[PDB]
Amino acid sequence: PLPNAVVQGYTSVRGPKRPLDHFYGRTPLNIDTLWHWVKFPHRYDNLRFAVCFWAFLVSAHFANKKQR
Amino acid sequence: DVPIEKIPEHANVLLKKIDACLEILSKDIGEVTDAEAHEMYFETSKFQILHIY
Ligand SMILES: CCCCCCCCCCCCO[C@@H]1O[C@H](CO)[C@@H](O[C@H]2O[C@H](CO)[C@@H](O)[C@H](O)[C@H]2O)[C@H](O)[C@H]1O
Ligand SMILES: COCCOCCOCCOc1ccc(C(C)(C)CC(C)(C)C)cc1
């Protein structure tokens, strides 16, 4: 279906690929290495519960007053 | 203006230079072993990682 050149990636000679840099002494920085810096929110979860309650309540209050 | 006895001095100079070069170029960087570089080799395993202690 396809010639061997397309599969192996070269017609005659296999060219050397420059390897990937590492940046010794620190973590890799890639699109997939970002969870090292940004975990899921874990610090303000209970504050999230409180603020969700208060937001619901205040919205309901002002909406009911407006409607009435 | 260059006698033939002065040639091996020049050859010695250039030998010193190229030896100072090759003692550095003889060194090469080995394979990386930092786990942070290879953590995705284990993340992508066909089974979840067992933290066994
Ligand atoms: C089957 C019925 C008949 C139809 C046959 C033709 C079907 C063609 C559709 C499938 C195409 C797949 O296309 C595929 O593309 C990749 C790109 O990642 C090529 O990949 C090639 O190039 C990359 C870089 O670009 C090289 O590093 C690699 O070594 C080499 O394989 C594959 O050689 C080719 O096979
Ligand atoms: C809207 O999205 C914003 C996109 O921009 C992201 C901004 O990123 C800048 C982050 O700045 C830093 C720099 C260093 C760090 C350190 C190295 C201090 C974090 C550490 C110690 C956890 C590794 C954290 C954040």
Side-chain angles (χ1 to χ4, degrees):
Chain A
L2 286 170
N4 288 4
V6 175
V7 171
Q8 73 201 354
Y10 51 91
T11 52
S12 42
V13 171
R14 185 164 72 75
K17 304 289 173 214
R18 198 204 165 71
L20 292 164
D21 307 294
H22 180 232
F23 299 94
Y24 295 90
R26 57 184 97 192
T27 59
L29 187 69
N30 317 314
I31 190 170
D32 282 9
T33 58
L34 296 170
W35 61 273
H36 288 270
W37 288 274
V38 189
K39 308 189 291 204
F40 200 70
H42 62 109
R43 298 176 182 192
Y44 305 133
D45 300 336
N46 315 134
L47 182 65
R48 204 162 55 234
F49 163 60
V51 168
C52 289
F53 171 83
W54 279 115
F56 181 89
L57 210 65
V58 171
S59 162
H61 181 71
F62 284 118
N64 198 63
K65 296 285 276 189
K66 174 161 181 206
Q67 186 67 95
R68 201 190 164 280
Chain B
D1 292 327
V2 168
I4 195 163
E5 309 210 331
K6 213 180 147 191
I7 280 163
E9 184 165 18
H10 298 322
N12 286 305
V13 169
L14 302 174
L15 277 155
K16 289 171 217 205
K17 283 188 187 178
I18 193 72
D19 286 320
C21 289
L22 293 170
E23 71 192 356
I24 289 154
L25 297 164
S26 54
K27 297 152 185 173
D28 273 308
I29 315 312
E31 275 184 344
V32 186
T33 75
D34 186 8
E36 287 152 329
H38 304 292
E39 65 197 347
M40 287 169 203
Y41 177 77
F42 308 111
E43 186 188 331
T44 52
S45 309
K46 49 168 81 79
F47 301 122
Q48 304 203 8
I49 290 151
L50 303 175
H51 298 261
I52 295 179
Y53 295 99

